């Protein structure tokens, strides 16, 4: 029956206490056995990366979609092992970067090591295994019981075994006692498996706050900087009182994009709402619509791989690419 | 018998539907009749700032305490009408220019306007006004029949009722029909009522993000930003591969202070835990623990309005000052 391939990156899963507090060690296959997993005959097991996830790079999201590219004909299902820190923001790269894969793509991890009595690592790798091999195609996160669309996932807790949620998204499935029961099937287009590697990884997130001024926007674009991000507060906009900062954004935003997204959790921005928020579009900014804040950086950095071009820059991050914004 | 004081700042709460849309333009003697309300008979109205709360600067925050302290005697409660935006900016940074007010502080403020059939603003000035006539002295939000400590508190929703949350920390009361029922009261030492305005309003916000390099960091120094805030991932730290930031971070964490905190939105850092931790610890990097990102970067304004020593600074953003901190 169905083939399900392992890969390793790392993470809290993998972790062990050492020296320095804990870090990443064990290979993929050692955590599915201490973990108790048994229901995996014909699985095979890849370690690509062994880390913390805050130390990924924009290159290892790169080798991972390769990886994935190279092994969609070959499995029924992948599932690939994470740190929690960082997988939000893997988990909507390799969303652009491979686009229609003709399996389910599934990102998991756990908040305690694999290792410890309580782990949440065997939940999760079970939520993962029921996902694999459940014919259901697109990259998607397994935590908690819980499967959620790759691109709408973000980290809203440090400490909890309920880490992850689907932001302004519907969850996909969720474990009703051994039952994972569909809730939500996105609407894909099935086009040709597209890989593409493509992106610019040099772009800055500042979060708005009172009083801020345009000189670090100016610094950032004399550093190269090719994109920038601000989280403005709740439905977005930029003050116009007490700062150059408007003022600097309307000549910046023509040689770079600056793209608004909401310091908040939930619901997102919306620029039309508010005299701040119109100013801002009149000064050249780009809404994130209801983008999590990981898709809105990576998308980001994924268009920047293929124009420089503002006015395009701006049509591409309101179209709904992969599911990650509502058009 | 009780007599309160209402402060009006504007907000979306005293807002219209103008040409550019929403801005504020209501006093909040007007808020207060379109709202409904008439359990009010002992009310002063003052109006200091009219605006769109994306607009308030920190010498707002200045004009405000002022205006607290000199009335904290005369009233037996005061409450702040706020624009949501920066309504937890506000009440953060009040708690610390304002401390041991003899008298409930309420910051309030609506989602949906005062004019529209629909509204929020009822509801929360009923909130608002039964705790400001408790004599439950502190610095409070109330908002969708909940009240918060002013420094616990954030905006987690842009566009629903229920848009602020106590962070880490218990509700102070709630309510349950007409009965505003107490869960926690904030165990306050009662010193002298202090008014402390100083603050140094100059400091960034960067979000952490895979590949972030250290050149932005020392572009921020070199232009005089006086703190750095980072928000690093889940529980805190530094990526060591990839990028020069560590070692960028070791060279400015003592010019400077460099503050940890999280981009997740509950449970805070622990730098401790992990290796990535530890070694943001040893580069002298300053935890924000499970203060809310408000309570982190107004109480980095206001310790930077007392020293510019780094040592001390760490000292003082580890104490817990208002309840803003678990020490
Ligand atoms: C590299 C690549 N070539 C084929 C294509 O683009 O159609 C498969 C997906 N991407
Ligand atoms: C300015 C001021 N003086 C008195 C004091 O510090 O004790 C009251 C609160 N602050």
């Not at 062990?16 to 993929?28: D, I, R, T």
């Not at 930029?238 to 600097?248: A, F």
Request: with cysteine; aromatic share 6%.
């Amino acid at each position: 029956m169905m083939k399900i391939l392992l890969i390793g990156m790392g993470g809290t899963i993998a972790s062990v206490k050492g020296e320095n507090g804990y870090e990443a060690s064990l290979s993929v296959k050692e955590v599915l056995d201490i973990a108790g997993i048994k229901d995996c005959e014909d699985c095979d097991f890849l370690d690509l990366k062994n880390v913390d996830s805050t130390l990924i790079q924009p290159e290892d999201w790169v080798d991972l979609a390769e990886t994935l590219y190279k092994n969609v004909k070959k499995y029924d299902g992948i599932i690939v092992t994470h740190g929690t820190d960082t997988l939000a923001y893997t988990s909507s790269m390799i969303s652009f970067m491979l686009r229609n894969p003709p399996i389910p793509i599934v990102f998991t991890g756990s908040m305690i090591p694999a290792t410890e009595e309580n782990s949440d690592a065997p939940l999760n790798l079970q939520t993962a295994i029921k996902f694999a091999t459940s014919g259901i195609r697109g990259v998607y996160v397994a935590f908690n019981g819980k499967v959620m669309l790759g691109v709408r996932t973000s980290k809203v807790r440090t400490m909890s075994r309920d880490a992850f949620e689907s932001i302004n998204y519907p969850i996909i499935a969720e474990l009703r006692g051994e039952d994972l029961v569909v809730n939500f099937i996105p609407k894909f287009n099935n086009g040709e498996v597209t890989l593409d590697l493509r992106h610019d990884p040099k772009v800055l997130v500042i979060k708005l706050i009172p009083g801020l001024s345009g000189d670090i926007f100016r610094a950032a674009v004399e550093l190269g900087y090719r994109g920038i991000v601000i989280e403005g507060y709740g439905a977005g906009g930029i003050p116009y009182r007490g700062s150059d900062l408007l003022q600097t954004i309307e000549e910046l935003s023509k040689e770079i994009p600056i793209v608004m997204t909401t310091q908040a959790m939930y619901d997102g921005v919306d620029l039309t709402r508010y005299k701040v928020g119109r100013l801002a579009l009149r000064a050249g900014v780009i809404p994130a619509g209801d983008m999590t804040k990981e898709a809105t950086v990576t998308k980001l950095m994924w268009i920047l791989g293929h124009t420089n071009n503002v006015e395009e820059i701006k049509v591409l991050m309101r179209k709904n690419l992969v599911g990650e914004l509502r058009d």
